[PDB]
């Protein structure tokens, strides 16, 4: 019944994260693209994002990342390891997308 704020926070994230998992049948995403999306939710950027706009968030976030700096994605594409600089840069960049 009643949900403690700790529980509620998990539920709000959880429900939204589950939405994020879903994919359109017969149309898979690129490997490169999966890294930021998982970054967003894990680093709690998708915590605030209202449930209705999750689909929008994904497409827009990816478009944003490429337009703002596909350089980051190229780096993560080759390095295949998220450096501390990349992690911070991505935190900053993702937060930037969250704002829009």
Residue 99 within binding range of other proteins, rule CB under 8 A:
yes
Eight-class DSSP state of 52: G
- Cβ(89)–Cβ(34) under 8 Å? no
At residue 92, the 3 state secondary structure works out as: helix
Dist. CA 39–CA 10, nearest whole Å: 17
Compose the 32-71 pattern: x for residues touching other proteins by CB under 8 A, - for all others: -------------------------------x--xxxx-x
Q: CB of 94: closest distance to other proteins in angstroms? A: 13
Which residues contact other proteins (rule: CB under 8 A)?
63, 66-69, 71, 96, 99-100
């Amino acid at each position: 019944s009643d949900l403690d704020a700790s529980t509620k926070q998990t539920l709000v994230r959880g429900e939204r994260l589950t939405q994020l998992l879903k994919q359109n049948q017969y149309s898979p995403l690129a490997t490169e693209e999966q890294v930021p999306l998982i970054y967003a939710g894990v680093n709690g950027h998708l915590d605030g994002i209202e449930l209705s706009r999750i689909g929008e968030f994904e497409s827009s976030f990816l478009s944003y990342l490429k337009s703002n700096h596909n350089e980051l994605l190229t780096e993560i594409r080759e390095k295949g390891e998220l450096s501390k600089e990349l992690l911070a840069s991505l935190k900053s960049a993702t937060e930037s997308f969250v704002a829009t």
